Symmetry: D3
Subunit: 313 residues, 6 copies
């Protein structure tokens, strides 16, 4: 298998582009330091917002936005190539369509300096997050030591359907960059269930904040394919490492019978209809019975406009 | 709200209809005694296989099968009306289609001795369970103290999409009657908690106890808050798990929460309604995993079950 | 110090005096077997209702009641003398005043065969328990290994003022015999710890097992340090023994030496303001009264079918 | 109910009055930031010593002392008014009587800038604390979402009698602001026991540590009325948040029979004398432990304090 | 790897040989039933004293002693061959030297029905156990799924030097069959975890649950090679702890690891080969604690045993 | 008994002798301040590398090494005498043999300023640590409140034989100063087992930080039966508790069924344990040594021939 490393990267305050650049260099220095301290490490992970922070007053402005790929991702690509590692990074990506809000984007770069995975946050943390829903789906790429990497972003991990989708497309190591975190206990909970439901590893790491900007939030969790937590970090700069053996997870999906739950879902050769009776979500008409009387269905509580479009530029 | 009671019933060792009748009367006596011990109790839950046991050599035979409803469920209904409680029971149900295998069925009976919910196990615990996949979907019913009750069966609770479905239909107290375990033990506690948190509903779950000729111990009755917090936990046989459930707070959270209102976020990424979902594999009945060709267990032959389907084990 | 044993005793169903006699001999059998297994043990503890069970339809009748002292307590005394141990026993005691309901009584017998502590449950578990509120206060007696023993009964241990009371009179080893539960499981572990830490004393606590005609799975069994740290934890099975060594002198030293965390002293010496403020001493004057008493749903035993006019009933 | 917030404020090192004003502005800037991050929060709580720190060499000097009310409490009140929240603050209060040491004082301010609760620490953390014993008893006030708030200060929370007193006067949400903590495990323990003993919620938060470098000294906790821990802080600006439902603690006190312990204490309609028929000492002011004669610490001379009383450390 | 099962077997009182023979059939009935319940199981593990119990008044008598191998071990071997599993059994063994006390013995049998490992308890649980110190050392044998099996007996597991020894001979799966406890309960879980981590091997442990006529002493445990508990008996008689063991992962770590390869570090601190401890004395048979003169228990007189050695209790 | 204090000391970054001097004064100020806040404390413990840090580029250099004893140890000694406490300190010690690498040394200083214990780490954390294997064995001294103190250093604590060795020589309070920590869980695990195996207390504390900003690297007091009594959760976090070594002494004298340390040599029992033997003769050899990937320090860029390097 392989050795993974997740950094409970702290996020200081961000007030300008030079602070974003300062973060970028800091992330790169960390990546080289981590490789020097753990020579065997092949995958190094940074949390969501590590590049840009969470300045809600400026985080939609063009100054605070980057392109993917771009000169900043190329610096990360440069860093991965000479350190000879896979790296996971966070970019608040400028939308190619200027009338839409920016995306919340995660990328995985290989030891050759190539972006091999690009994911845009499918489930933004509403109502606080103004990011446009991702349009690239849940992609999977080839990782080190026989791993099939997929990455989700913070809130995404609370949606078991998304963990199912990654594993459906072949993922055996599910990465979750963050983060939150009023949700601390449920973050531990979902990292374990995401693992167990789909017979895959989960490697997760949260940022470290309060305002949310005091250097203490992220946990850093490694879960076995059976849901058992192998490594647990506390609440900045805390590094969570551990050996991952994706093959044991792959074998479990092949040999297991009784609790092969991911297979059971489609083969109750079993009944191919799960009920799904007379599948709303698939047709885009997912509707809860209590939607009419809900209090929060827009971002007005956080000061955002309700008509949508581009804002905060 | 209301007070619930989950009984970690000892798995019976069953060799005939006579033993099945002994179990029913034992369940009935336990129900009346739980009411006597807890006068404010409104929901008494029994686990999967508490009526018929797990005699794998015999459990497909007609002698070991009951109709739902039938003479046996009416005896449960009488007890419920006499005790004035909601009751959750388990019956291995004779398939009205004599060319198909029996269902694994759960029923909820109200304080007036009427069946208000009937659920057929959607996900049998393959490959050990030869039950036919349920055809009734996931139903929801009115319960005590403003609750909307739904019930799943052991293995069913390992499927997050099913807990989503119950909630999608208005369920705020998710019931899991179970006949595991000692190999899925830690994950049984995990899923009971995740099923709650994912959908902002209470989960009330209980497993049986003695599944051999004896071995009277599995249990682990569990009550979880809508935020995934475990309120009450059993260890162990005849262990009773009681707690007060306040379903109104779960309903209010669904209405008032924003940041962690995940059950809403799923359909409103008014958000992008398509979750990608880039069509509908499961919905179109073509759910297929890339590693399916090399899987070892895709039938029941490992437990000696025929692989051509139809009715077997009479 | 000394070695302690707490038995998560299973009480079968009691339907007659014969069954009570069977329980007595079984408890005696258990005491001698525990001494043989643990030759160093000096304190053996049996839970509430271990003698007479919890037949709520017959437990108020004369057949189900004993005298303290009586012919049965002297069987316990004989066993304790033969084995040379301190023993803790439970007896539902017939009230000498025949116009009143019976007490829920606990006793401690010394290795000399004498009753050295007699306690009547001060706080019955209302509304399910019909026992008369005990009139003997909270007594403290001398024990083995420098220990000063006091015993409370199940529901008693949920009252922090009672744990205070025992310690206030010298107790360093707070014993809790119990017949719960499965609705107070977590809170039983909680209060066994808090009762210890509040007063800088050890707590040794044990609960029963069964009632429903074949069952027996209720108890826990717990030994806590004087700072509230749990040392030994029994599970929930019948016959489960909880053993551990107790060093009572260390608890006493903590009460003498400690300054910052000496909370039992701080209560009366805020040489400090002697008035705790405490600015209506209601409980002391017997006029303790909660603001929501008018609107309470359960203030008698009618929910369980008990007469609401007091006196003697259930004979 | 209502959404509460507890901030594990970092202990400031204080050397002058400027540093105190620096803290006040920091607390005010933290309060407005919490409201912005959680638009639904109605109660933001700060720990003991958040305003003035723990400079034991200077914490008795008039420079380090404020009045309640004063211009500093009016700054907190102005902040509460502008943010529209209830706020809990700490003030080392100058004693209006000149022959007595300063008080350790907590105040609750409502969304209109009114101080609706003033409490002086009844049990100072002796022998390290020189504060005069409080004289205002244990007050209770109305809060948001139908709550009845009461506050104790750090050491006060180790005294169950005080938790009992708060509840006795109607409190359903017991607040504990703190500047501990060599008592870490017993902090979590007593936070749960205070809740359960009295059938009320507890919300507790501790300051974060002294010495110009150390800034991380304790936890932060929310407990349900049954003692169950709901949220747990687990270092400086950690924010502990959770939704509180006080009416269902009220309901428990009205509904419960078996474990309605707070009622059982007075009605063992029960015997009114707790018996307590031969240890009724604290009422008359005659509390006396049998071992008081041999105690090693009964004054503050271990930390350099004088032993004859009066005003000192000026 | 392979699937392992550990049964928290109960043993009732034993009063005669007819009870011992009843135990053997029960163990054999359980073995076939476990294989039927778990078709993939390759290792079935029974606890210490599961064959003969702990009648301390008769366990030294000829009536209570068996030969290893012998007619009774043949019954175990036949059962293993029929079920096609490895089996681990417990036998109190008549000493081939009739002038010395019996041994406390454990055996492993392969699916072909052959004894491939025999071990005699090196550290009897003094002073309560009268068994003779084992003379066969700590053996290792080949098991299923690339495992190198070794077995220790209850009290043997509290001695870290023995766990080191097994691994030193190749063991990657350290089995602990046990007949404690409830006075060493917490430390049993501890040592199983440390025994694994110290030597980078799996530990599979199980205790008897019954020896009195309290059938609840067991606590089956599977630990990962880094100390992590994977499955925990939790607990009761007839409770079966199951889990998949992947021995090659432990072997790889011993080959690949650098920073925590402690088993290698011990002898190569190419390192200083002399550890510089020399209590390692023990090698020369001079192990001597500085406080032996003042110890209370150095014989079995407290349990009534004579202090002259030789054969007794016959 | 006595009161103990363990400081989860943060180590900032060390780039010069000046920084080391700053570390020394910080420790001294912390020692006096802990005495002030806890006037009843008699043992204050500082973690491994608190004096010199972990600059792996320079930590073998002559600038970064001190002599034991030296004027830096006499600064600590002066502080212990003025505060009247026992102190435990870390020193990376220049090897008197200039052809060999420096030791990783721990010292205990009493209230008289006397170093009563000097321990050179027997088990350097290979392959990352280049320190020379200690030659002073596992020493034991007389501590406060009836204690017999021994000190092991970080990685030493994963070796139960060493914990056995300390106890064998009388130790009833086993101190572990540490600069880990990827092994956070196993650290808590071994602190408990070291205690239970030998019927002695264990007081342990790990360092905190080095990454130019990072400080939060993993403080534990365990009872003689292995039960954790106090557990730290910060850089600068102080772990305190009262230790009663007499109760540990008594258990060793009193216990029968539970006396494992005695049983090891008295299976009067069989004195042969039943071949540790290879280790005594210096021939400890694992069957899988030939296929191991890490038997030197080339993974971290160290030379593989021994001698003096990094100076």
């Amino acid at each position: 298998g392989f050795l993974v490393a997740a950094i409970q990267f702290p996020v200081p305050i961000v007030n300008s582009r030079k602070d974003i650049d300062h973060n970028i260099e800091s992330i790169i220095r960390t990546l080289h330091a981590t490789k020097a301290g753990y020579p065997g490490v092949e995958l190094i992970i940074f949390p969501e917002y590590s590049t840009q922070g969470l300045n809600t007053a400026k985080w939609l402005s063009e100054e605070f936005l980057l392109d993917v790929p771009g000169k900043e991702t190329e610096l990360y690509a440069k860093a991965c190539k000479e350190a000879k590692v896979y790296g996971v990074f966070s970019i608040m990506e400028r939308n190619p369509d200027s009338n839409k809000n920016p995306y919340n984007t995660a990328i995985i770069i290989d030891p050759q300096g190539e972006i091999i995975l690009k994911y845009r946050k499918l489930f933004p943390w509403n109502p606080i997050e103004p990011w446009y829903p991702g349009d690239l789906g849940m992609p999977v790429c080839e990782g080190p030591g026989g791993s099939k990497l997929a990455v989700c972003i913070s809130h995404d991990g609370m949606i078991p359907e998304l963990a199912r989708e990654a594993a459906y497309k072949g993922c055996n190591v599910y990465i979750r960059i963050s983060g939150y975190s009023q949700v601390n206990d449920q973050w531990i909970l979902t990292n374990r269930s995401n693992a167990w439901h789909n017979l895959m590893y989960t490697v997760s790491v949260n940022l470290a904040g309060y305002d949310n900007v005091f250097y203490y939030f992220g946990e850093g969790q490694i879960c076995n394919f059976d849901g058992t937590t192998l490594v647990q970090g506390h609440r900045p700069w805390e590094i969570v490492t551990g050996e991952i053996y994706p093959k044991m997870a792959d074998n479990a999906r092949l040999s297991w019978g009784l609790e092969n739950n991911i297979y059971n879902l489609g083969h109750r050769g079993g009944e191919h209809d799960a009920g799904l009776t007379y599948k709303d979500l698939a047709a885009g008409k997912y509707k809860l019975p209590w939607e009419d009387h809900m209090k929060i269905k827009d971002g007005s509580i956080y000061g955002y406009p309700t008509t949508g479009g581009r804002f905060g530029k």
